[PDB]
Design a protein around this ligand. Structure first.
Ligand SMILES: N[C@@H](Cc1cc(I)c(Oc2cc(I)c(O)c(I)c2)c(I)c1)C(=O)O
Ligand SMILES: N[C@@H](Cc1cc(I)c(Oc2ccc(O)c(I)c2)c(I)c1)C(=O)O
Length: 263
C-alpha cells in the first residue's frame, strides 16, 4: 500500500515480520530481566582489589598458573551468574517446551559462551576492565591469574572489539538465544526442533540487524564471526576446566559450577 511504501522508502533490507517482532520482544525482556544491574553497572561496580590476582601459584598443564585467592573471589559470585543464564533460558518458549533433559544439555553447552558475552559487552575502555555480574570490575591480569588463563585474553579482546558494534539489549539477547539453541551437543532428543528454533532466532536476528541500520559496514557477518569467537572461548574454557578439576580439590568448586562444566 501507499503508506507502507512511504514508511519503507528508506528500507531495502528485510525487516522483522510481526511474528519475529514477538520473538524479539520476548527474548529482549528475558535478557533484561536476568541481566545483573541493568544500566547501572558502571556506577555500581567495585574494582577487585589490586593486590588480588597477582600471585599465580598452582600449576596447570599449559603453564598459566592459578592464583587461589583470585580463583576463590571469582567462584564466590559465579553461582548467581550461572543461575541468571538458566533464568534467561527458561523465559524463552522454544527452550522451555523442550524435554527437561534437552534443556540441561543446552544450558551446559552454552553457559560459558553466554557469561563471557555478558562480561564482554561490559568492557570499559577507559579503565580497561571487564565487569563480572555487573558488580566486579576486573583487570586482564587478575582474570587471567584467577583461573581463566588465555581465556581471559580472548574475552578482553572480544569486549574491546564489541565496543564499536554498539550492541543493544535486543542484539545481546538474540546472540544469547542463538548460542543457547545449538545442536552441537551429544545426547539431545529434539534435534530437529532445536535447529528450527535456532533458524527462527537467526532469521529474526538478521532482520533486527537490518532494522537497526548500524553505521559499521558488513555488520551481520561481522557479528556471526563474533559468535564463532564465543564458541572458541567456550571450548578453551571447557578444556581448562578439566585441568582445574585434575589439579584442585572439589571443595574449591561451588556445586553448580561443577555441575554445569563437569561434562
Ligand atoms: N547451528 C550453527 C549455526 C551457524 C552456522 C554457520 I555456516 C555459522 O557461521 C560460521 C562461520 C564461520 I568463518 C565458521 O567457521 C563457522 I564453524 C560457522 C554460524 I556463526 C552459526 C551453530 O550453532 O553454530
Ligand atoms: N559477567 C557475567 C558473569 C560472569 C561471571 C564470572 I565469576 C566470570 O568469570 C569466570 C567464568 C568462568 C570461570 O571458570 C572463571 I575462574 C571465571 C565471567 I567470564 C562471567 C554476567 O554479567 O552475567
Amino acid at each position: 500500500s501507499h503508506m507502507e511504501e512511504m514508511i519503507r522508502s528508506l528500507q531495502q533490507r528485510p525487516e522483522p515480520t510481526p511474528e519475529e517482532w514477538d520473538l524479539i520482544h520476548i527474548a529482549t525482556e528475558a535478557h533484561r530481566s536476568t541481566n545483573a544491574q541493568g544500566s547501572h553497572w558502571k556506577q555500581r561496580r567495585k574494582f577487585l582489589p589490586d593486590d588480588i590476582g597477582q600471585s599465580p601459584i598452582v600449576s596447570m598443564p599449559d603453564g598459566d598458573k592459578v592464583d587461589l585467592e583470585a580463583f576463590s573471589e571469582f567462584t564466590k559470585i559465579i553461582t548467581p551468574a550461572i543461575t541468571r543464564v538458566v533464568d534467561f533460558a527458561k523465559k524463552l518458549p522454544m527452550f522451555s517446551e523442550l524435554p527437561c533433559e534437552d534443556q540441561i544439555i543446552l544450558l551446559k553447552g552454552c553457559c560459558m559462551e553466554i557469561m563471557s558475552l555478558r562480561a564482554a559487552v561490559r568492557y570499559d575502555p577507559e579503565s580497561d576492565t571487564l565487569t563480572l555480574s555487573g558488580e566486579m570490575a576486573v583487570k586482564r591480569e587478575q582474570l587471567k591469574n584467577g583461573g581463566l588463563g588465555v581465556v581471559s585474553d580472548a574475552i578482553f579482546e572480544l569486549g574491546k572489539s564489541l565496543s564499536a558494534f554498539n550492541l543493544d539489549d535486543t542484539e545481546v539477547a538474540l546472540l544469547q538465544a542463538v548460542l543457547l539453541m545449538s545442536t552441537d551437543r551429544s545426547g539431545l532428543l529434539c534435534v530437529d526442533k532445536i535447529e528450527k528454533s535456532q533458524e527462527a532466532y537467526l532469521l529474526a536476528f538478521e532482520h533486527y540487524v537490518n532494522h537497526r541500520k548500524h553505521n559499521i559496514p558488513h555488520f551481520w557477518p561481522k557479528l556471526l564471526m563474533k559468535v564463532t569467537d564465543l564458541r572458541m572461548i567456550g571450548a578453551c574454557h571447557a578444556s581448562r576446566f578439566l585441568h582445574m578439576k585434575v589439579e584442585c580439590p572439589t571443595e574449591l568448586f561451588p556445586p553448580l559450577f561443577l555441575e554445569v562444566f563437569e561434562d
